[PDB]
Amino acid sequence: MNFSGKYQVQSQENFEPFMKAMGLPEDLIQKGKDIKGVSEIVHEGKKVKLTITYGSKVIHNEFTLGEECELETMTGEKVKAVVKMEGDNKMVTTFKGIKSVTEFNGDTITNTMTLGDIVYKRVSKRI
């Protein structure tokens, strides 16, 4: 599945509870509650490039399929994580103890983030 290009997030779930646990107050939560961003996915061989905008900040990371790859956060902390495709459509990468699932269906992507108890989802659709 080589369909590298940009994907702008449309739908998302559980943004509040994630940011809430992230230390975000309901008031700021309600404001951020409908923020997504523009993501870009370029898949080369095993490695797939992920550029994801969260509101103001943009994280650019590339990872190798079935291969241990280091995930670089918006903090600069980069950790070796092994990503291969779980969710059947796209790949899951566990890093910093957090479990991140991606599902790529045709032109749409379902991004499921898992932090301990808090689960987070985004759906990015082809632009």
Curated annotation (Swiss-Prot):
Q: Which family does it belong to?
A: Belongs to the calycin superfamily. Fatty-acid binding protein (FABP) family.
Q: Which residues carry this modification: N6-succinyllysine?
A: K31, K36, K46, K57, K78, K84, K90, K121
Output the Pfam families linked to this UniProt entry: Lipocalin_7
Which cysteine pairs are joined by S-S bonds?
none
Task: Briefly state the protein's biological role.
Answer: Plays a role in lipoprotein-mediated cholesterol uptake in hepatocytes. Binds cholesterol. Binds free fatty acids and their coenzyme A derivatives, bilirubin, and some other small molecules in the cytoplasm. May be involved in intracellular lipid transport.
Q: Where in the cell is it found?
A: Cytoplasm
Q: Where does (9Z)-octadecenoate 2 bind?
A: S39, R122
Q: Which residues are modified to Deamidated asparagine?
A: N105
Q: Which residues carry this modification: Phosphoserine?
A: S11, S39, S56, S100
The organism of origin for this protein: Rattus norvegicus (Rat)
Identify the keywords attached in UniProt to this record, alphabetized: Acetylation, Cytoplasm, Isopeptide bond, Lipid-binding, Phosphoprotein, Transport
Would you name any one GO CC term?
Answer: apical cortex
PTM section of the record: Deamidation and transpeptidation at the beta carboxyl of Asn-105 forms an isoaspartyl residue found in an isoform of the DE-III fraction. This rearrangement gives rise to an extra negative charge carried by the acid form.
Q: Name the chain's protein.
A: Fatty acid-binding protein, liver
Coiled-coil annotated spans: none
One of the entry's Gene Ontology molecular-function terms is: lysophospholipid:sodium symporter activity
Where Phosphothreonine occurs, the residues are T51
Q: Does the keyword Acetylation apply?
A: yes
Comment text on domains: Forms a beta-barrel structure that accommodates hydrophobic ligands in its interior.
PTM N6-acetyllysine: list the residues.
Answer: K84
Gene that this sequence comes from: Fabp1
Q: What is its main location?
A: cytoplasm
Give the residues the record marks as binding (9Z)-octadecenoate 1. Answer: K31, Y54, G55, S56
